[PDB]
């Protein structure tokens, strides 16, 4: 679990085809607003 400490240290540092295998990553954009933007 030493990896999560490193991000926490990075988190303080701010304070001053690909097969997916994890749920941590980018944020999906809302599909309904992408629908309503163009077709409606």
């Amino acid at each position: 679990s030493a990896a999560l400490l490193r991000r926490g240290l990075e988190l303080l540092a701010a304070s001053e085809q690909k097969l997916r295998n994890s749920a941590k990553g980018k944020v999906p954009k809302s599909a309904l607003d992408e629908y309503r933007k163009r077709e409606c």
Partner: protein, 324 residues
């Protein structure tokens, strides 16, 4: 090209019905895929006549259709005409539970590798399972995301809670500003996170990371709800009770961040916080295990001293020794 026409026909067939029955059928086929032999039960697919490669392609086509339907124009048109996200009450949280359970199960089956060439198909199946997960969340507004993420935290399984915290962290890291009511909705998750950290050590450390992210994102504007968190952090750093080194360092980083955000509010806790911290570093100074433990402890001192310079006077001599 047969895939495209057949999937369009299936899209029309599914979207003829309403959204509730569609999502219920998705959960039912998720269960049916979960109960497959992988080489009583309602036999709908004939394993006996079909080859194993055909069953493999069956699972692959099923999950691909799941994702494509959730991304299809017809389904979104049906949702918008039906009224919007408010039609989906109660369905979304059970859908998240089912998707996370199935993806954890297929990941565990992938860990049970038989080598040969099944490994590639299992990796692809995990990839489209995560595609299903990412498309389920895209139909879920940020307002409804918080009660369901709380419920997923309340799930008994340990991997589902980890996936929930990962999704919460992802939404928290998107560097986009927030409306006031949404910030108040985020604020309510703090007691539940404090309950989680206070179980697997990764879950507690991830909860501490979520608390640190919340304190970074909103701690400047609404400091008061973060006052209890620091208290719990001190109870973690106290040397009377033993804690995992990995969660001890994360507790130290949370201490540093919260004391940075709570510059003056941390005064009453300083008589309890400061004697413990020193002792911890001494032990961390004795250990030669890794750089990160010592660096986190030094971060704790640096932020405590910089944010609150004038109150370490009764402890001053002590820290000078720890300086040397």
């Amino acid at each position: 090209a047969i895939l495209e026409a057949d999937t369009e026909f299936w899209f029309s067939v599914c979207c003829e019905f309403s959204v509730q029955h569609q999502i219920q059928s998705l959960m039912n086929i998720l269960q049916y895929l979960l109960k497959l032999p992988e080489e009583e039960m309602l036999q709908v697919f004939n394993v006996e006549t079909h080859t194993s490669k055909q069953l493999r392609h069956f699972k692959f086509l099923s999950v691909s259709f799941m994702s494509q339907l959730l991304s299809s124009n017809n389904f979104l048109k049906k949702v918008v005409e039906s009224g919007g996200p408010e039609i989906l009450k109660g369905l979304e949280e059970r859908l998240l539970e089912t998707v996370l359970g199935y993806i954890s199960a297929v990941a565990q089956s992938m860990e049970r590798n038989a080598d040969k060439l099944t490994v590639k198909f299992w990796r692809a199946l995990l990839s489209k399972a995560y595609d299903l997960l990412d498309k389920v969340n895209a139909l879920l507004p940020t307002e409804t995301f918080i009660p369901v993420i709380r419920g997923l935290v309340g799930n008994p399984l340990p991997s589902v809670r980890r996936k929930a915290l990962d999704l919460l962290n992802n939404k928290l890291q998107q560097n986009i500003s927030w409306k006031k009511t949404i910030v108040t909705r985020f604020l309510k998750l703090v007691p539940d996170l404090l309950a989680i950290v206070q179980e697997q050590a990764i879950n507690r450390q991830t909860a501490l990371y979520t608390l640190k992210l919340l304190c970074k994102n909103f701690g400047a504007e609404n400091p008061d709800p973060f006052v209890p968190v620091l208290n719990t952090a001190v109870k973690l750093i106290a040397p009377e009770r033993k804690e995992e080194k990995n969660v001890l360092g994360s507790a130290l980083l949370c201490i540093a961040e919260v004391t940075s955000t709570l510059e003056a509010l941390a005064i009453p806790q300083l008589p309890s916080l400061m004697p413990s911290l020193l002792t911890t570093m001494k032990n961390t100074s004795e250990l030669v295990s890794s750089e990160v433990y010592l660096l986190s402890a030094l971060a704790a001192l640096q932020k405590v001293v910089e944010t609150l310079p004038h109150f370490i006077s009764p402890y001053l001599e002590g820290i000078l020794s720890q300086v040397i």
